Design a protein around this nucleic acid. Structure first.
Lengths: 46, 174, 50, 129, 150
RNA sequence: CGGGACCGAGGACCGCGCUCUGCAAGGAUGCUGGCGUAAUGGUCACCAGCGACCCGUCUUGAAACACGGACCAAGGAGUCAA
RNA sequence: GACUAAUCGAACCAUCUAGUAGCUGGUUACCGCCGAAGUUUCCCUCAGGAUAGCAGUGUCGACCUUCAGUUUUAUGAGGUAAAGCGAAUGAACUUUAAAUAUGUAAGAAGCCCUUGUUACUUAACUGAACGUGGGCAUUCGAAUGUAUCGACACUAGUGGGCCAUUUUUGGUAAGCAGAACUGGCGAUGCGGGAUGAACCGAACGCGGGGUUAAGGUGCCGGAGUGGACGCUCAUCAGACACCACAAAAGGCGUUAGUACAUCUUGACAGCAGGACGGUGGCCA
RNA sequence: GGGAUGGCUUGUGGCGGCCAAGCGUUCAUAGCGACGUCGCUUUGAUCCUUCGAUGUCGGCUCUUCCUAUCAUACC
């Protein structure tokens, strides 16, 4: 994998470039799950 | 192709610990000079025995002169030549006084009749035909005929190209 | 001329056409001359030539 | 095998995983390690564009990375030169401590008596028949 | 044609002063003669610094001279090819022998009052033509507002 | 050992040399003839052999297209201040 | 949307006003010294930007340290050719080992040893890191080249152009389209390809002599109706061809060959003769 | 303020299968394959199935050329 020098300089220690896509996927899943839980709570209130 | 000479070229693989006395390979090469002769030797050795020039060495290069250059001989040449179809066998005959002269006549003949260049021709055998009965081609058979004698009709006389104008019309009878 | 033959000719000091130099034959020089073979003619000079 | 920051490594992609993989240029390249990971490693590789060099940083999985023997000859020669110079000072005899290129071969004579040469045609007659 | 991958480089240093000071021209002639006819590297350095512009000749103060006069240099002749200025923070001027391009009035007065000697560069050429027992001093070149803003 | 062509930079001596009374050795001298003026040389006009697109300007990578130019004189466009 | 003094989808006159334009046009003596460039990297694109790179003038610093689009050596990648298997085993076999270009490394600024600490690491004073001291100048540890240094300052154009060899990725009925390196051109004259952006040779101060390159030597046209051996006759031959037409194509054109076959027990071509009987075989 | 495919084309369909002289291969018997051929595309009928302009053609008047010939000449 090609690595940008600025991104690897700003990268925290211990983390690798091989987990970035899993991190992004986890963030997207977390946002979608939060929206689903909000919809469920509103529907249960109704 | 050129003023050719025949060279005995002897070469070998470079000696190693496993092979302290490598085999000697000998070839007869028709070439304009010794550099071309050694290059053709290494080309054929690479094509045959997988011995490279970098791992090999030249042991000897000698000129093989004709034994009787004043004796008229008939020569048979077995060659293979490469065309767009592929490789073709050929047996031809030449009436010359030396093997080198026969080989040059062969190169001129191949270039004239089949457009075969030097690099597409492999000379496999050059032999002197020991008997008159060994001659196969009619263009040599008519020359080896008994009591051969011919005239020369319509001989254009040799006139200097710098003498533009002539006062008499030339004759073509001598 | 490509950059590698150009650099080899510069290191051999053959900067002009019909320039000539003496070279001691080693492998390290022979490979250089073999690379610049499309621009040079070379050989073994005798005492009269030298 | 574990790697540390600063050592020299070679990159060799091995097996069926080298099939359509996007960066074929870095295969067979040698670089210096800057980052260490349990399953990966960070390598600095220099590229040449015209007269100048540029620096690229790559992440390579450790199954495609081997330690290099680039400086092994230099360290071996340094050690050998040290011991040979010490031995030369002990014995009072100069010795050659520099590599030299390969020289042209000298003159020698090759005998023929048990090694008679074989005459070869451009093609083999046993192949002709 | 001749293939020239490398280029012959014209000189990137001053060969002559840009100034029109006639006395500087006479000093330059004298030190050209000295640099040609002597082996002393001091003369060549002095000639080259005489060629120099003003930002390349920063002033040297009496406190800087007094700092460099310590540790066995008290009897050497101080050579500056710039202006020697006075430092009022230095309350006691040591005895010194200074040859400079020019002096400020207070620096000259304080050197002569401490009992030292003030010379010009032609007097320095007369007394030390080979630069023997000299201490060559330069001022702080990077102590300029433009250099700070670079 | 012959035959021919082009050239003669420098301007006391100094040097390397040699075949050493001197020389072909760190760059041409010697002898002779005609003429001493348009003879050599030069300028202009024309013929002859060979050579040779119409200038800016624009465009893009470049050409082509396009635009300006009947001719001449005089003005005529990177200045001053902070 | 007609007319309102040849002026009207808002008259005419003067002023603000030398209004603004990123678009068009133009922008004035000579010589000398240098001398360029087209995704490098980042930013939401087009009606986008910076920025790397390449240049010139000044200087200064010991213009000190040497460095290098190159080879060699060691080791990677390419094990890929190849030799053998009277070595084992069976491109995937191996003792050995290709070609093209290609990465890394090749010293005193270096190498090694020793002592401690560690906040790294290790079962661990163990490795490694940081310091400490010492040894190694007997050669400074390949070749070749080396008017090729460094650091500032200020200034300027160009920074997603065209063509081509090679490598590579895709395609089309056929065309072709992306990248990478390199070379050329835009900026460039000269000799030759009759002619000319992309071809070959060769790069340019003013002159004289000599010799060549590519290309040429029947005349135009400087140089050969030059030499040797052959081939070819075209009812618009051919002479700068490779691509297409276009096929394993059609030729009682002409040569040189290869294979198979017949031949004094008479081949191939002819001429003179035979070419018979069951039998008008069966069905229709 | 700019700007205004081309030595092309012609007379014989496509798709699928088969055969096939040959090319290759003969430690694999695969893969190309001209010539062909086979299948999809009313007893001289029906006349009660006309299936979309973005692309533009014209006419005089007059001359010449090509041949891929309708007529005239010959075969």
């Amino acid at each position: 994998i090609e690595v940008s020098a600025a991104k690897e300089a700003m990268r925290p220690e211990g983390t690798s470039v091989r987990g970035d896509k899993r991190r992004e996927i986890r963030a997207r899943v977390k946002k979608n799950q939060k929206q689903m839980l909000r919809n469920q709570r509103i529907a249960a209130e109704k | 192709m050129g003023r050719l000479q025949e060279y005995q070229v002897i070469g070998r693989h470079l000696p190693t610990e496993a092979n302290p006395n490598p085999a000697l390979y000998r070839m007869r090469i028709f070439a304009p000079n010794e550099v071309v002769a050694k290059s053709r030797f290494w080309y054929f050795l690479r094509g045959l025995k997988k011995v490279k020039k970098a791992t090999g060495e030249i042991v000897s290069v000698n000129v093989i002169s004709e034994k009787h250059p004043l004796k008229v001989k008939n020569f048979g040449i077995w060659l293979r030549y490469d065309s767009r179809s592929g490789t073709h066998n050929m047996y031809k005959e030449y009436r010359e006084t030396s093997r080198v002269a026969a080989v040059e006549a062969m190169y001129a003949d191949m270039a004239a009749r089949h457009r075969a260049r030097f690099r597409s021709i492999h000379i496999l055998k050059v032999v002197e035909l020991e008997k008159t009965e060994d001659v196969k081609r009619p263009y040599i058979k008519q020359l080896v005929a008994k009591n051969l004698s011919f005239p020369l009709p319509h001989r254009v006389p040799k006139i200097s190209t710098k003498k533009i104008f002539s006062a008499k019309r030339p004759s073509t009878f001598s | 001329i490509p950059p590698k033959p150009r650099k080899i000719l510069q290191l051999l000091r053959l900067r002009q056409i019909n320039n000539g130099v003496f070279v001691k034959v080693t492998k390290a020089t022979a490979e250089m001359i073999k690379i610049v073979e499309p621009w040079v003619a070379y050989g073994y000079p005798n005492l009269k030539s030298v | 095998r574990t790697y540390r920051v600063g050592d020299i490594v070679d990159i060799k992609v091995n097996g069926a995983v080298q099939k359509g993989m996007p960066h074929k240029f870095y295969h067979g390249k040698t670089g210096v390690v800057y980052n260490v990971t349990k399953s990966a490693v960070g390598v600095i590789v220099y590229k040449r564009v015209k007269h100048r060099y540029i620096e690229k940083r790559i992440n390579v999985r450790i199954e495609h990375v081997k330690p290099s023997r680039s400086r092994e000859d230099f360290l071996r020669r340094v050690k050998e030169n040290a011991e040979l110079k010490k031995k030369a000072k002990a014995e009072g005899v100069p010795v050659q401590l520099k590599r030299q290129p390969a020289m042209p071969r000298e003159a020698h004579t090759v005998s023929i008596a048990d090694n008679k040469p074989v005459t070869l045609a451009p093609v083999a007659y046993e192949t002709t028949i | 044609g001749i293939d020239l991958r490398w280029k012959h480089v014209r000189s990137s240093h001053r060969k002559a002063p840009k100034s029109d000071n006639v006395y500087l021209k006479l000093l330059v002639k004298l030190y050209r003669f000295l640099a040609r006819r002597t082996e002393a590297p001091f003369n060549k350095v002095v000639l080259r610094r005489l060629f120099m512009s003003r930002i390349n000749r920063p002033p040297v103060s009496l406190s800087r001279i007094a700092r460099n006069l310590k540790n066995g240099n008290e009897k050497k002749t101080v050579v500056v090819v710039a202006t020697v200025t006075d430092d009022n923070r230095l309350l006691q001027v040591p005895k010194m022998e200074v040859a400079a391009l020019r002096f400020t009035a207070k620096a000259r007065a304080r050197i002569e009052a401490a009992g030292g000697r003030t010379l010009t560069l032609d007097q320095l050429a007369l007394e030390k033509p080979t630069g023997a027992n000299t201490l060559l001093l330069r001022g702080p070149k990077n102590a300029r507002e433009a250099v700070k803003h670079f």
